[PDB]
Design a protein around this ligand. Structure first.
Ligand SMILES: Nc1nc2c(ncn2[C@@H]2O[C@H](COP(=O)(O)OP(=O)(O)OP(=O)(O)OP(=O)(O)OP(=O)(O)OC[C@H]3O[C@@H](n4cnc5c(N)ncnc54)[C@H](O)[C@@H]3O)[C@@H](O)[C@H]2O)c(=O)[nH]1
Ligand SMILES: Nc1nc2c(ncn2[C@@H]2O[C@H](COP(=O)(O)OP(=O)(O)OP(=O)(O)OP(=O)(O)OP(=O)(O)OC[C@H]3O[C@@H](n4cnc5c(N)ncnc54)[C@H](O)[C@@H]3O)[C@@H](O)[C@H]2O)c(=O)[nH]1
Ligand SMILES: Nc1nc2c(ncn2[C@@H]2O[C@H](COP(=O)(O)OP(=O)(O)O)[C@@H](O)[C@H]2O)c(=O)[nH]1
Lengths: 432, 64, 45, 119, 65
């Protein structure tokens, strides 16, 4: 028999590495169209803990996410609650367009204002406002920390602040806010930095830090600091410290106005929702959105072929992949589209057919940047209307992906993409 | 990364179009006998409404 | 149900499938498929 | 834990890992050989040729068998066993064995012994 | 230590702990420490006395509920 010390040396003797390369596995001529279940990714070398794995994924060319998890823009999956929690857990949610423009615009607004660094146009109450009116406002707005202004206007002179603790055990509901409102409120001078303002609030050990000019400009909340502390992988705007929000719109002329209202609500990413996205209408819309709203990131699709991706890219911040009579197997569609699309630096979303961690790992291995979940997320508490809360569930998927990455021998999604493309990562076709 | 304006130009770089031709798909020697459920037709370019589609079919040489 | 409702449904459905494919007529579809313009993918079980 | 087991007259030690191609298991194999030389060490689980080479370079025997990450057992046993058999390292075919036919097929593919746990 | 108070909160489930000189429930009251006090404390090695509220509002014994 051969010596044990010659194993690595003898290993080089073989013409090719054990298993199949991505190019060999994804052969339309020999193996045909494939799905996630049709193949497996072979294990490599484990020299790092699963903890060290980085799951940062690029949703668009200008947008990067901590976890590559995207909520589908479906009536039964993504709403204001689902979008907020998905962003909070290092993922983003696309709001469903199966509603009026006003209704959809409000949902984007709610997600944008759930967490803030500097509160803009903060809700304020009049000095003559009744205690009952403040209680009526809390259920309506969902928050009870309202500063008091002389004219009842957001930019009015600041006369004090009223909170939940102030009216919590008030026997008389007919009393004015002025009598029940805190007389002296700790505030920060206008022009102060967010870090400097946060320091003043931390020392003060108070719930709110209104910012004045002595008129009211913006307000800081202790709660936001707690939200940031509790969720450190949350997907939010670095400049505003607000959760990133995505919405789904049509390719019709009527959606041009609907998009305007959504953009006005602070919408960060727009996804063009089409079964077949390779149309003149969607191509014309992409150009219109770029000219009309340049700062907005546009995700174009759905595209299942290389030609479709080229056309949408020539117009597209990101690409949505996934499509009875007309369509393509998801595994084959992701690799072919992603192979061409990846060259131009366009991140691609693998949409549909994702029910487990294995599907997520396989989809990314095939060249996908992020994966869209719509059947899995459905039945969660955060979903409109049982798999439990996404708070517990999203952390589970994130941990699972790290372990699968460790078994493969890749410390990051970026390394995984490079190793698979380099042929280092090996695959095996699975028989029925 | 490659420029976005070079996508269509770069598209011609590939030896053959994405997907299989009818001749390639209908191979008795390699894929064997096939049925309707066994294959799918890939989407192309949509520059017309569905309304404009004409479904006129020839039942016989003299009947349409 | 009645074929009056059902036949119109099949006719509309065929038009949509033709639109997704990128062919404006059955004649064009036949020519494009024969020309190799139309592409197909084998489906695994 | 191994020291106490060795003290009890333990003959063969199997390193229990879903993926056995790690620095920790590689370091453990060397530690066990230096600390308890008489003990026979079975390393794994390995489903690929590269994994087997790494564990062999460290392994008295190899344990073969591994959703998102894994390999079909028939393909894994032949590929691992083909390389491993050259160095005189007996390989155990672990998992998927429910009948005599599986046992016969596993050995035919180059496996030395078969592991039974559901049966 | 501030860390000990944090360790106590998970163990007891509440963080509103008054401070006594001898550390006994019936000891002289020197102040009270709560969740808001240690919520954003960068240094975990600090004593409770420095981070504990200096003046605490209390009720005389024999007072009705
Ligand atoms: N509020 C608000 N939030 C928005 C808005 N838009 C978005 N949001 C978001 O919604 C979230 C608000 O959540 P929250 O602040 O936890 O809920 P809330 O209902 O606003 O809090 P409250 O119950 O009012 O606090 P509570 O009165 O219980 O303690 P505290 O304020 O310390 O009270 C303790 C005592 O100290 C006094 N006090 C409080 N602050 C004071 C100050 N600066 N100076 C002097 N005194 C002060 C008070 O009067 C009170 O009696 C934030 O994440 C925020 O970003 C908006 O328009 N308004
Ligand atoms: N605590 C406790 N609970 C038990 C025990 N056994 C059973 N329980 C039960 O457990 C429950 C306790 O729940 P809880 O009180 O809501 O939770 P907790 O962790 O104790 O509250 P905390 O977060 O400490 O309040 P927090 O500090 O956020 O606000 P506050 O105390 O106003 O802080 C605001 C600021 O004001 C200062 N402050 C607070 N009180 C002060 C006072 N009297 N005088 C002067 N200053 C005061 C504080 O230092 C803080 O900075 C109660 O139902 C209680 O009956 C026990 O042994 N201990
Ligand atoms: N008011 C407020 N401040 C925030 C928020 N998120 C972060 N900060 C500030 O940012 C600092 C911590 O930065 P870090 O958490 O690393 O930034 P992140 O990566 O955006 O979460 C703290 O000093 C906070 O004052 C927020 O949602 N609201």
């Amino acid at each position: 028999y051969r010596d044990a010390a010659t194993a690595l040396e003898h290993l080089a003797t073989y013409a090719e590495k054990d298993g199949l390369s991505v190019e060999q596995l994804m052969d339309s001529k020999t193996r045909g169209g494939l799905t996630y279940n049709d193949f497996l990714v072979l294990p490599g070398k484990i020299d790092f803990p699963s903890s060290e794995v980085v799951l940062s994924s690029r949703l668009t060319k200008k947008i990067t996410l901590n976890a590559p998890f995207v909520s589908s823009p479906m009536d039964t999956v993504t709403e204001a609650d689902m979008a907020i929690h998905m962003a909070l857990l290092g993922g983003i949610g696309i709001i469903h367009h199966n509603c009026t423009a006003e209704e959809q615009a409000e949902m984007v607004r709610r997600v944008k204002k759930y967490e803030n660094g500097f509160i803009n146009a903060p809700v304020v109450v009049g000095p003559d406002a009744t205690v009952a009116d403040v209680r009526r406002m809390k259920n309506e707005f969902g928050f009870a920390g309202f500063p008091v202004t002389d004219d009842g206007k957001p930019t009015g002179k600041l006369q004090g602040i009223i909170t939940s603790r102030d009216i919590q055990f008030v026997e008389d509901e007919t009393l004015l806010v002025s009598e029940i409102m805190t007389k002296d409120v700790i505030t920060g001078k206008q022009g102060i930095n967010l870090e400097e303002a946060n320091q003043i609030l931390k020392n003060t050990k108070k719930g709110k830090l209104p910012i004045v000019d002595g008129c009211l400009v913006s307000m800081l909340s202790r709660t936001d600091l707690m939200k940031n502390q509790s969720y450190p992988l949350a997907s939010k705007s670095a400049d505003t410290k607000q959760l990133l929000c995505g919405a789904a719109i049509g390719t019709i002329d009527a959606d041009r106005q609907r998009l305007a209202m959504l953009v006005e609500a602070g919408l960060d990413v727009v996804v063009l929702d089409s079964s077949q996205g390779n149309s003149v209408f969607q191509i014309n819309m992409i150009k219109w959105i770029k000219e009309t709203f340049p700062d907005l990131q546009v995700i174009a699709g759905n595209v299942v072929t290389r030609e479709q991706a080229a056309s949408l890219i020539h117009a597209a911040d990101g690409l949505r992949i996934g499509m009875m009579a007309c369509g393509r197997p998801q595994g084959t569609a992701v690799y072919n589209v992603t192979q061409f699309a990846n060259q131009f630096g366009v991140p691609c979303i693998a949409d549909g057919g994702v029910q487990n961690i294995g599907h997520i790992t396989k989809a990314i291995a095939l060249g996908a940047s992020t994966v869209m979940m719509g059947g899995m997320l459905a039945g969660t508490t955060e979903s409109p209307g049982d798999k439990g809360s996404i708070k517990k569930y999203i952390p589970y998927l994130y941990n699972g992906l790290q372990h699968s990455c460790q078994d493969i021998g890749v410390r990051s999604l970026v390394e995984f993409r490079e190793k698979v493309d380099s042929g280092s990562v090996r695959f095996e076709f699975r028989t029925p």
